[PDB]
Amino acid sequence: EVLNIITATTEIELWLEPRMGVNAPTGDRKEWYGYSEVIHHADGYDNNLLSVQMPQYSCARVQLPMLNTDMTCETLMMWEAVSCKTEVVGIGSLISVHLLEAKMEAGPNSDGPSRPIEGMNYHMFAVGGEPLDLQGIESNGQTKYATAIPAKSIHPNDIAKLPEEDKAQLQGLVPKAKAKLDKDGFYPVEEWSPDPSRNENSRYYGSFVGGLQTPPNLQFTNAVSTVLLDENGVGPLCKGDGLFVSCADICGVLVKADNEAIRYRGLPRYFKVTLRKRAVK
Amino acid sequence: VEVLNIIDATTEIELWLEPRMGVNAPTGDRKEWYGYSEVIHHADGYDNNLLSVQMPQYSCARVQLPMLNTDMTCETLMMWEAVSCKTEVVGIGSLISVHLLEAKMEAGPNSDGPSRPIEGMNYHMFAVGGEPLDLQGIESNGQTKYATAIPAKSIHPNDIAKLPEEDKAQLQGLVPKAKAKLDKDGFYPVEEWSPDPSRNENSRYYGSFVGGLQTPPNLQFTNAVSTVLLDENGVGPLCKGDGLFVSCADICGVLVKADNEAIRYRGLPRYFKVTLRKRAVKN
Amino acid sequence: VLNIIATTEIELWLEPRMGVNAPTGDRKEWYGYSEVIHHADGYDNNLLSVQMPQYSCARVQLPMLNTDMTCETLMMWEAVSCKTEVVGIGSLISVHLLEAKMEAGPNSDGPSRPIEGMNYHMFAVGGEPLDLQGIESNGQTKYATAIPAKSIHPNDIAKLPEEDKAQLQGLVPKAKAKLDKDGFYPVEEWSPDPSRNENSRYYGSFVGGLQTPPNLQFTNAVSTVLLDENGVGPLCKGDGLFVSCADICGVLVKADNEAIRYRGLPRYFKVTLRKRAVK
């Protein structure tokens, strides 16, 4: 039960690095950090699709200053997210036409530029007072996924647990396939969406442009804010004094020269969130 | 100028509409293609019968609201009035996939590249009303051959207009007799039926179409946007029989088959949240 | 134009006039399309009216307002707003179009090319026929000479010598007409005249090319206000409301010669009117 604002503010900022699959600059895949592993047409059919091949949501919880010295009291204060500025950094890097290992965009006897990053763009950011609610889906119900222990990603049927002969249901809406975005680099974009049936205490904003050769269209400015207040003037209220931020920013794909397969490329996203104190019952 | 760098009165209803692209249930022989259409080829409907499973259809539902009037003969009645709605197509991220089962490879013949992703025609419409959505029929080709099914799995404009087969070219324009109510889920093909702008006084509908086979799908998703359903007089749809009627169609593109380059449509589920209030009206 | 004085709503459909303008005769199966167009038509043959999409138009008789037309102060119907919609947009998803080119390799069994390419969409509401200005993309295009005429061309009015018809590639002031006949004025030769049309409102868009994705919307929640900057809408002379449109939604490509047909769709109109006293 939301009461009146207490007149008292604070701002937090943070960066979320992309989780395109290669999620750390370490090991033998280090050079491909910020990209996915290679994806081929029959992957997941004639082999297991790996987590490194599946771009994932980024997320973090920011701890806010503690508000109530006694959690038993009938009236308490909560942090309320009022507005946010957010930005995808590094967009100029997408002009490169000398991408390592990338297909040449010219005739077979030429010496032209590489294909630049282009194709599918999927951009979403969210700010909320608790983890983002996710709804699960499968483009192909019977896609084969790797089983690592511990798991490196989670899939809708890990939660829905349909019998294998019923997994075609996941190509529609399966209500049991729901989860919270509670782990960075774990929930694949191609299987999980913000759940519009929940998320009463979060705000999310997403866009998608598909295809493999589509020009990426991105903007950057520090002159624009997003107001997080709902129709009643109430922003997300931060349970446990935690602010939750999430995003995904697939900016396109790289095409490999030797087999023409692809890797996704993502870019880091900045957040600046402005909060105020709100009394609640 | 120099060059300077020179060197209970209200209620909320929620529901999901699953897509009806043709394969309309994860059952039977076609179970694995639920949420897609059946395969379509250029001569289908000419050198064979076009099947209902090959024709994406409108989704629709009626939600029973709390009953408002004990005596429906009173000259002043209460009705539910739809004021606004939030709606969203879910699963958009799934459209990034370039490992689509049976799909054509987007690369040279000696390569091992990605599959073609879902792309091409996008047809998106949602509607909220106090009675079934009014539909007007049309045909792109008047003489298209349609399968005869018992029980029938779709209905076509000429099942209503009942024109002689030799006059069916009329259906390529506007045939006033070819009208229907969106009264059955997964039954009215998108390619034959549109919202009827000459009726639908008690419904609101919103549609967009981008054609072509290789067009990049362009879709948005957010929980911070609502659609106001009130008309110019401040009146929203009024729910007859205390029923709220929601409808949609969301073709998100096509898949291209590797073995013959024919296509299947792909659709995605749509969520609705409708906010309603009560209005007294003359009876 | 005096003050307003009560209201009424007019509805109608305009069926497309793409060339094959009736579901009768020998071409009846292509009603709502143009006849086939090839690159050299109008050069090594005569371009037919059935090959040239045309404006649709109608005059709706409104309730008579004045007992005596002699009076110095009369009532006129004033068009205030309108809702308009292109119906049948969903039919443009078809990839099983009769006689259409296959969009796949020569060894495949793929879909047909769908309707796509150039879109030309215009609607107008006025108190008198829409004024048109004529033009030619090619001054010397050869047009058939039917009796009676099935279409009218700019030089039919301007009557320039054959050696001067290159003028029609620019602006010929003599090449003016009124949109007074349905399925008669070709879109490729006639445009709404911005130097006239004081008593009409028109709204048009064009996206060219042969393979362009068609981009259309449909909704019953949007209206167009027809009032001008003085708050005055079109005034219906002779108690007649004049509506006109053209909606080329793209082209079909034929499998056997790769030539094209334009495709059009019907348009709906709902016009709201009020009574206005005039001098």
Added chain:
Amino acid sequence: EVLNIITATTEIELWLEPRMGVNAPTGDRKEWYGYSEVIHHADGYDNNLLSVQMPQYSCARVQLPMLNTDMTCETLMMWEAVSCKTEVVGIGSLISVHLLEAKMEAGPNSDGPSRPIEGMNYHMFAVGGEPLDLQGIESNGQTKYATAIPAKSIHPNDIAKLPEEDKAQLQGLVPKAKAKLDKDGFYPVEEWSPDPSRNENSRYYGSFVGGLQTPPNLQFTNAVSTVLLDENGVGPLCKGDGLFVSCADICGVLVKADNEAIRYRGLPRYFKVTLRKRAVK
């Protein structure tokens, strides 16, 4: 020094015919009036680029009613342009797929449509109280231009007069390369832009979409006007009682069947300008 309005009005109409290169329906090139001459990749390198090959700005001066009985008076009247309606006519003609001499858009054994007009669109219009100020540039500083006595067009270096070895400066910003749009069909669009460093007494509006196969996107209506007043509510003031209108409307190109070279196509533009009387010092 601008003073108050004098409360008196007038409306001016005119058409500007396109000047794509073939600027009159006369002479040897008369049948291509409203188009450019044919342009090939090496034109201006292994030959001289001709004025007929370079689309130019259209412009006109409209004489307004004389306002002042005596131009020596300390307070005078000027016509002030307040708003304007403008329209490109003939857009429907761009649907044509039977264009004379044009490449066929089908396989070589077919009998399909011609390529329609498509590709780069350059649309600008301007209304001012004096000629539009232009700034010059060259995409290639060493482009070879024909010499006619008298000249049929004027180029930036005709004004800047840089040594031949210095003409690469014209690929950037050369302040000496300035001109007034004082002659119809004379200033090529590819060499001359509205000068944002001047033009205090004009308003111009321009858009460009490039490429050779881009779908042309054009609108037409009589329900929209452009307001010409500046931030202080002052429109262009007509010096010498002359109103100056300018434009360029490249709507795309035609592709010739026999060599695949191109001609630009333009369309005429209509103007309706509304003016009022303003007192000035």
Added chain:
Amino acid sequence: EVLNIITGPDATTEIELWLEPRMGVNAPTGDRKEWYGYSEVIHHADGYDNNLLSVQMPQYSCARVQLPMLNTDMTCETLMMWEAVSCKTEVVGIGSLISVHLLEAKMEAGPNSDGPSRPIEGMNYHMFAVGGEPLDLQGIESNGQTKYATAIPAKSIHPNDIAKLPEEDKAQLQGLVPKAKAKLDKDGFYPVEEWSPDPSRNENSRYYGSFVGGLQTPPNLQFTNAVSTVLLDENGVGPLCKGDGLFVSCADICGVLVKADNEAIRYRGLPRYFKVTLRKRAVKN
């Protein structure tokens, strides 16, 4: 500490300037002079089979404008600063992008034809900024191990010149490396493919940018003298000019030229005009 605006008849001023593009060939002199306003040629394996040169990497343009001196004594506890209120800015020369007779450019036609050249098209990168101090930049690498030429003196500066990561850790620059930060303090020096405006700083600047990628994308550009950008923030305060300096910067890649003989590319940029309106604002010192 921002105080109130100081009203008066001489309280505002206006500044105009041009910035020429820095696509790589940054002066019309020397051996590369005929390609001024373009980049040097770029090929797929450059930076791998060879060193990527500064002339191959478009850079931000920038300038500091000296404003009228405001405070005779910078000792005083209360001072005045120029406050940037609005800006008009325009990319000039857009009409030149219609050319289909580009020197050395690939022919857009069949192999035995005589058609037009490919016009400038492809990726467009447009940004402008106005601030009261240099624009803050954040570094990144699309490929951490890209090979760069090391000239003495340096012709450009790269994110790891500042971050100084070990060579085997440079993959970190493909994400967000907080030490990879710089100020846009030198014209024709910071490549756009390695440096973006830093959204974590730039409190005293305003920047506006767009990108449309790909190699064949139609350039889409507007020009008009009837539109301004308001520079005031949510509290109505514009950038405040430290040391009486106005800082402007930009980058305008309008597309690429494709060479006929190897199909490699050069970027093309165009010059940008600025008109900045400023007013006097009192601040606490």
